[PDB]
């Protein structure tokens, strides 16, 4: 069976990369 | 300034004083170390800033208020909620049409921060109608028409509208955004490419119908090309998107293979960036859960030695991802494919990993060993395999696992001992 990203993330978080969620303007 | 001096200027009957105080607020909220967001909120300044966004006459105070609100919305969920609660979402959508590109850009940015907070605010930005004016800013024949920073902001904000789960974005919204996403995925700017790949990675994580929507757009060859970029900020989301696609149907997985993705995996499975190598191993695990002809393409690309390598030496989490990839291979492969694993050296690194005390990985390894023995039984190779397992110290481990506390471990090891080592 195929395993979706949610299961990989449960095995491996914290630290699984993701895009920037919010950005502060300097 | 102090917040009191800002409030005094904001609450003056002089517009130039208001612009000056709003400017001082924007600088205070942009300072490096702990900007006083909450003191500005408690001062009641968000409704004034939102009012300023509507001052089409005084474009400087529109820009300064949009910047100040952007940096409040960059904070915690409670700080982003204070911005939404002040009516900012429709006020920013109205500003997308500003004749001043730098003010329109600031509104794009603020909307990205709001949508980035979570699925409810994402869907609320969509309900207020943000998608049509955002896409209209990108509806030019040549994307190099637009300023580079402008294009990067539009791409990032669109990616946050594609982001997050429980629930996923509305189907109609994803359908409306996707064609623009496909164009941006081919644009020659590294940050635009990265955030385009992030957007696609979000859209491809979920039910296979969501994968199908993206793959129907012809995006997989470009994703495979970006898989080979030198910029780690591009490879990371490109590999995530490819990894998501191969969690889908066999035909969806075949599109990744037909585009040539496997030729990149010798480098990905030895990449010194830990998360790249680990996610490439996870991706292989879902490919080796596919059809026997897809396992054969893994074989033909020479990737079994690379999986032996990851199992032999990698950080522990990555080794465990490789163990899963091997157990999937042994569950679905032909007898010929399975004993080829043994020829490539899988047994010794499998037995070495069985030193781990975690019940979960023990069961994964014992399942793989059982599947390999079943293939060896059909070929007449069980005695060769038994000798190999004994000679690397693996029999000692299996024999001792007959006295493990867990019933599933203890019965699997007993079964291997009775069938193959008596």
Author numbering:
A (entry chain A): 13 to 38
B (entry chain C): 76 to 497
What does the report in the manuscript say about this coordinate set?
GM130, a non-nuclear Golgi peripheral membrane protein, has been shown to bear an NLS-like sequence, allowing it to interact with Importin-α13. Since both Importin-α and p115 bind to the GM130 N-terminus and Importin-α pulldown by GM130 is enriched during mitosis, we hypothesize that binding of Importin-α to GM130 during mitosis may suppress the p115 and GM130 interaction, contributing to Golgi disassembly. Our data describe a molecular mechanism whereby Importin-α modulates mitotic Golgi morphology via a Ran pathway-independent interaction with GM130.
